[PDB]
C-alpha cells in the first residue's frame, strides 16, 4: 500500500487516520506499529485543561511515596 511521507515513500504499511503514541519512528511526525503495519501521525499526549478561575484552588488530600 504505497504512501508518500516527507521522509520518503513507505511501501507495506497502511495510513490510519487515527493517532497514537510513537512505536517505531519513521520520521517527520509519522510513526508505525503492528495494528498489519499501520503508519499514523504521532500523538504528543492526552489533552487536559485545568479548570482555572479567579477564586478556585485545588489542595491534595492524600500522598503516594514512589521509588
Amino acid at each position: 500500500n504505497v504512501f508518500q511521507t516527507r521522509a520518503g515513500c513507505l511501501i507495506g504499511a497502511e495510513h490510519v487516520n487515527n493517532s497514537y503514541e510513537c512505536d517505531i519512528p519513521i520520521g517527520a511526525g509519522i510513526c508505525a506499529s503492528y495494528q498489519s503495519i499501520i503508519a499514523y501521525t504521532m500523538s504528543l499526549g492526552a489533552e487536559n485543561s485545568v479548570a482555572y478561575s479567579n477564586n478556585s484552588i485545588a489542595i491534595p488530600t492524600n500522598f503516594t511515596i514512589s521509588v
Partner: protein, 308 residues
C-alpha cells in the same frame, strides 16, 4: 531577560561508497580492499543523527499531558499574548516564536527531524498553559489550579519578600511585567546578535559540508580529479595506481568530516543537557541557584521555541 540555547543540529548522512568512488565498478573493487572503514563511518553519522532527536525530546517532552489555557484570559492584570499561541498564524506560533523563526547533492542526504516544528510548539504551549494555570504543581505530581495573582505571591515568598507586597502592588507588578515582555519583542527583533548562538550551529555545519564537496575537486597527486578520465585515458593496470591515490585522499576527507562532527555533536549534547535542566528547574519550579536562571531573584520562566 532571554537565554538562547542550541539543542539540535542537522541530521546528515554521507554514503561513503558514492562519495569515495561514484558509479564506478573499478573504484568500488579497490575500495573493498581497505576494510570496514566505509561501514564504520556510516554508523558514526547514524549515531549523531539518532541522538539529535533525543536532544529535542528531553528538552521539550517533559509534559505527559497537553494542557490548554482557559478560553477567557483573566490572569489578574497580566497579559501573556506575546508568549501564548495565536490562532491566525501557524496557529502554534505566538507573537515571539514567529519573530524568532523569521530572524533565523552527491552521496549526501539530510534526514528529516522526527518532531516537526508544529509538535515542538504544542509542547511549548502545554508547558506555558500548565504554568500560568497550575504552577510548580504540573511537573511534580497531579496538576492543581491556583489563581495566577496568587501563584506569584508564593513565588514572591520564595525570594524572601512577603505576600502583602504583591497584593498591595498587584497593578504595578502587572504593568511592570506586561511592559517588560513587550520590550523582549523589540530586543529580539530590532537588535538581535542573540540569535547568533543558534545561527553559528547552522553556519558551521554548512562550511564543513562545503569543504567535503570541494575536496572532490582536488587531485591528491593523480593525473586528474575525475574518475572517468583517469580510467578512460589510461590502461587498466596503471590506472589502479592513480585511483588508489584518489581513494586514500578522498577517504581522509571523509574521516575528517566524521571526527569533526563527533566533536561538535558533543558540544550540542551539553547545550541540550543544560536546556533540559533549565526547563525542569526554571520553567517547572523556582530556582535559588544564583544566576542559573537570570540576573536577579527568580520568580518564573517561560519556554519559547526557535529554529533548532
Amino acid at each position: 531577560t532571554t537565554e538562547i540555547l542550541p539543542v539540535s543540529m542537522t541530521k546528515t548522512s554521507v554514503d561513503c561508497t558514492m562519495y569515495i568512488c561514484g558509479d564506478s565498478t573499478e573504484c568500488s573493487n579497490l575500495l573493498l580492499q581497505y576494510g570496514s572503514f566505509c561501514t564504520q563511518l556510516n554508523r558514526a553519522l547514524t549515531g549523531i543523527a539518532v541522538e539529535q532527536d533525543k536532544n529535542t525530546q528531553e528538552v521539550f517532552a517533559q509534559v505527559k499531558q497537553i494542557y490548554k489555557t482557559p478560553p477567557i484570559k483573566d490572569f489578574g492584570g497580566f497579559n501573556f499574548s506575546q508568549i501564548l499561541p495565536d490562532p491566525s498564524k501557524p496557529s502554534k506560533r505566538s507573537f515571539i516564536e514567529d519573530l524568532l523563526f523569521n530572524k533565523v547533492f552527491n552521496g549526501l542526504t539530510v534526514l528529516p527531524p522526527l518532531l516537526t516544528d508544529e509538535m515542538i510548539a504544542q509542547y511549548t504551549s502545554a508547558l506555558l498553559a500548565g504554568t500560568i494555570t497550575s504552577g510548580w504543581t504540573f511537573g511534580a505530581g497531579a496538576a492543581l489550579q491556583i489563581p495566577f495573582a496568587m501563584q506569584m505571591a508564593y513565588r514572591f515568598n520564595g525570594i524572601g519578600v512577603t505576600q502583602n507586597v504583591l497584593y498591595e502592588n498587584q497593578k504595578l507588578i502587572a504593568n511592570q511585567f506586561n511592559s517588560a515582555i513587550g520590550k523582549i519583542q523589540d530586543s529580539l527583533s530590532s537588535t538581535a546578535s542573540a540569535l547568533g548562538k543558534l545561527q553559528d550551529v547552522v553556519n558551521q555545519n554548512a562550511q564543513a559540508l562545503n569543504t567535503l564537496v570541494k575536496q572532490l575537486s582536488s587531485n591528491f597527486g593523480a593525473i586528474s580529479s575525475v574518475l572517468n578520465d583517469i580510467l578512460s585515458r589510461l590502461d587498466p593496470p596503471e590506472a589502479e595506481v592513480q585511483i588508489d591515490r584518489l581513494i586514500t585522499g578522498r577517504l581522509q576527507s571523509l574521516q575528517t568530516y566524521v571526527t569533526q562532527q563527533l566533536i561538535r555533536a558533543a558540544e550540542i549534547r551539553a547545550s541540550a543537557n543544560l536546556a533540559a535542566t533549565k526547563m525542569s528547574e526554571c520553567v517547572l519550579g523556582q530556582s535559588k541557584r544564583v544566576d542559573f536562571c537570570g540576573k536577579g531573584y527568580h520568580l518564573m520562566s517561560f519556554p519559547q521555541s526557535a529554529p533548532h
